[PDB]
């Protein structure tokens, strides 16, 4: 249904399932020969690269969180607080 950046309600944190898919999803793309927005300090593993792409929060993705009723809340990996 769409939810404004405001009136936001979900967790401010990142569900492990979220991270893991992102991480996976990214690495996949990296190995798909995709642009990598960080200095590979000499990394050759798409995951490892993704993990870096993440600890510098430079991953162009937005998790769209869907709610039982259909409406969703979009959260970027830039925002999402990565504790774990």
């Amino acid at each position: 249904k769409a939810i404004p950046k405001d009136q936001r309600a979900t967790t401010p944190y990142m569900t492990k399932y979220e991270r893991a898919r992102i991480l996976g999803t990214r690495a996949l793309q990296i190995s798909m020969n995709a642009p990598v927005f960080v200095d590979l300090e000499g990394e050759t593993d798409p995951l490892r690269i993704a993990m870096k792409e993440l600890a510098e929060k430079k991953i162009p993705l937005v998790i769209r969180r869907y709610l039982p009723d259909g409406s969703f809340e979009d959260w970027s990996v830039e925002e999402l607080i990565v504790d774990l």
Binding site: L67, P68, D69, S71
Partner: protein
């Protein structure tokens, strides 16, 4: 509220739903002898105004049906005389977290 003793004539009862709006109920004596709602296990329910509900829903993105239900003939459903639609707010004690809200629509 009508309180019979041994029973009512099946010829009689079929006259209650013949004068709306007004509503009628029927309890046996041996029934009311003890107030169940005082029972260790039964926790307090509560009726909710047709607004506190239109809210509960809104605030939970709930479709009427997705809500836990209570039997029209449920002991406590009677003790508070609910109607097809009214919602009750069962508030119990929890070993996980002292209190624990919960709700129940009425089918």
């Amino acid at each position: 509220i009508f309180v019979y003793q041994n029973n009512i004539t099946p010829s009689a009862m079929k006259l209650v739903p013949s004068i709306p709006p007004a509503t009628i109920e029927t309890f046996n004596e041996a029934a009311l002898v003890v107030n169940i709602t005082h029972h260790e296990l039964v926790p307090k329910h509560i009726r909710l105004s047709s607004d506190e509900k239109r809210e509960l829903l809104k605030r939970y993105r709930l479709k009427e049906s997705q809500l836990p239900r209570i039997q029209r003939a449920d002991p406590v459903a009677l003790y508070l005389g609910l109607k097809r639609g009214e919602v009750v707010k069962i508030i119990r004690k929890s070993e996980t977290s002292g209190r624990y809200a919960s709700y129940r629509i009425c089918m």
